[PDB]
Amino acid sequence: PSAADRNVEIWKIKKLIKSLEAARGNGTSMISLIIPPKDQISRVAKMLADEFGTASNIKSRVNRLSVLGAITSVQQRLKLYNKVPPNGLVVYCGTIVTEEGKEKKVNIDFEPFKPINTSLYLCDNKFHTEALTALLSDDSKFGFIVIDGSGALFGTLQGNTREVLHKFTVDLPKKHGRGGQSALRFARLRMEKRHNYVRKVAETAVQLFISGDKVNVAGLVLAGSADFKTELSQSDMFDQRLQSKVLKLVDISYGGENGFNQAIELSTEVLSNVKFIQEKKLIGRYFDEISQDTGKYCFGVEDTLKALEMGAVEILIVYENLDIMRYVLILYLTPEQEKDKSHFTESMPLLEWFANNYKKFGATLEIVTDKSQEGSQFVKGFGGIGGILRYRVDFQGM
Numbered sequence: 212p213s214a215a216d217r218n219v220e221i222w223k224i225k226k227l228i229k230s231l232e233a234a235r236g237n238g239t240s241m242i243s244l245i246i247p248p249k250d251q252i253s254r255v256a257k258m259l260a261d262e263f264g265t266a267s268n269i270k271s272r273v274n275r276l277s278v279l280g281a282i283t284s285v286q287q288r289l290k291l292y293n294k295v296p297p298n299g300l301v302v303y304c305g306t307i308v309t310e311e312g313k314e315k316k317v318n319i320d321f322e323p324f325k326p327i328n329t330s331l332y333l334c335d336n337k338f339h340t341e342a343l344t345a346l347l348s349d350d351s352k353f354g355f356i357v358i359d360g361s362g363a364l365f366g367t368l369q370g371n372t373r374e375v376l377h378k379f380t381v382d383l384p385k386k387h388g389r390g391g392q393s394a395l396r397f398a399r400l401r402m403e404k405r406h407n408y409v410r411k412v413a414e415t416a417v418q419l420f421i422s423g424d425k426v427n428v429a430g431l432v433l434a435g436s437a438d439f440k441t442e443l444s445q446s447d448m449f450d451q452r453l454q455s456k457v458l459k460l461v462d463i464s465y466g467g468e469n470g471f472n473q474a475i476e477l478s479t480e481v482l483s484n485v486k487f488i489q490e491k492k493l494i495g496r497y498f499d500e501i502s503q504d505t506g507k508y509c510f511g512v513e514d515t516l517k518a519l520e521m522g523a524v525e526i527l528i529v530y531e532n533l534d535i536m537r538y539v540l541i542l543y544l545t546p547e548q549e550k551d552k553s554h555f556t557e558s559m560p561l562l563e564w565f566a567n568n569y570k571k572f573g574a575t576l577e578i579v580t581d582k583s584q585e586g587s588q589f590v591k592g593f594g595g596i597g598g599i600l601r602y603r604v605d606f607q608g609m
Contacts, residue, residue: 219566219576220324222531224343226563227319231338234317236307240277242285243339244302245331252294258332259286281305281334288320296322299329303338353458353482354420354428356412357474358435358443359466363412365419367428368475368482375468376419381408409442413449421453430482434461434474458482493577494585497528497599510597512543512561514606523573523601527565530586530595531578535561561596573601 234241246255263282269275284304292300302320309315317338329342352369362380366373384400420428431453433440443449444457461477463470481488500508509518512535518524534545538558562578569576581587581595589595 215575215577216570217324219569219578221347221349222578223566224323224346228340228343228347231303231340231343234307235337236305238274238277238336239334240281241305241307241333241335241338242281242303243331243333243335244285244289244300244304245326245329245342246295246300246302247326247328247330248295248297248299250295250299250328250330252289252292255332256286256289259289262334277306278334284316284318288318291320298323298325299327301326301343305338351429351482351485352427353430353432353478354426355471355474356416356420356431356433356440356443357463357466357468357471358412358433358439359470360436360439362467363408363415364467364471365416366471368478373475375471377415378467379411379415381411383408405442409446410448413443413446417449417451417453426452426456429456430458430485431456432459432461432474432478432482433457434459434463434470434478435466436462436464487583490577490579491583491585493526493528494579494583494589497589497597498585500599505603507600507603508597509600509604509606510593512594512596513609515596515598516543517606518598518600518604519572521604524598525573525601526575526577526599527569527572528577528579528589528597528599529562529565530590531562531580533560533562533595535596537561537564 244255246252259282263279263286266275266278266282269278281304285302288302288304299322300320301323303317304319305317307315307317323343323346326342326346331339331342333339350370350372352367355364355366355368357364357366360383362378364375364378366375368374381404383404384397387397420426420431433443440460444454444460446454459478459481461474463473463477465473497508500506509515509524515524515527519527535543536546536548536558537543537560540555540557542552543561565576579586579589579595581590586595589597
């Protein structure tokens with residue numbers, strides 16, 4: 212588990228989906244192999260073997276060598292895996308026409324984060340990625356609890372997908388009567404049935420939102436009126452992890468189902484901007500180092516790599532674009548790269564590098580955008596690559 216680390220993974224997918232769809236060679240030489248979890252490898256290995264045997268007959272050298280090579284190619288990757296890992300196995304192999312009309316051979320095998328029963332096996336002119344872009348259906352789901360004086364409600368907002376889950380009700384000690392009983396005796400029974408609501412509710416929500424020893428949602432908004440909910444967050448009969456991710460405390464007029472929409476209308480933004488929020492927060496904290504004397508910061512390629520290479524800098528912050536290429540067929544040059552590169556002595560874009568191997572530096576990679584003042588200044592003003600260090604470091608000249 213681990214968000215932020217989870218979002219680096221999505222980045223790579225989109226990057227891969229991009230290059231994959233940009234390709235298209237010359238006939239049945241494109242293999243898209245997706246293998247669902249638990250399904251069996253040898254089942255696949257045989258089908259491959261079969262396909263190979265059948266292709267062996269083709270007899271049109273060019274067309275025969277084409278199909279054979281593809282199949283060979285994927286078999287050769289498949290042999291590396293001892294069995295489908297969890298989430299499964301995606302595999303792309305084949306020969307494509309690249310720049311200069313030369314041939315390029317693609318070899319991709321790897322485990323994602325869940326493409327079940329997609330079980331795919333196609334040989335075409337193009338790679339088939341619909342399976343990958345689907346992983347890109349990651350809409351954060353939020354939890355709603357809308358209290359009231361006449362009844363509670365629990366539902367979810369996810370994208371534009373509204374969902375009313377459960378809805379019970381209470382009829383607290385309302386009536387007063389004409390002298391027929393004491394005041395205290397009333398207030399008593401009063402701050403008694405509430406507590407027996409402040410519960411049943413705070414209880415019919417843990418038996419809901421937190422399904423499987425973890426909250427099956429990422430936000431949780433408590434909406435109602437007059438502390439009928441503020442006596443629910445800082446409470447004892449509710450909390451436990453759930454009090455931990457209460458995002459908004461929204462005041463509506465008239466609740467239950469009607470106030471659900473009012474809750475949802477109001478909660479959009481913080482919920483439709485969650486990434487930009489944490490993203491602006493992150494970069495802000497960064498700007499903060501730069502501003503105090505504590506100064507545990509770093510930026511620019513040179514010193515970041517330098518700081519990265521040495522000890523442990525807490526979070527590496529990099530812009531999603533980053534006109535900077537890293538070769539060593541090790542340099543780090545922008546598209547200034549059209550100069551006296553005195554020949555060879557793995558041309559990967561720098562961010563592409565940072566992703567595959569940052570897990571081994573001190574952790575946490577944060578790709579950010581310029582869709583804010585914070586990210587625009589992080590880029591326009593500090594080359595969009597810096598880091599939040601864990602102890603001051605001295606950089607000197609150049």
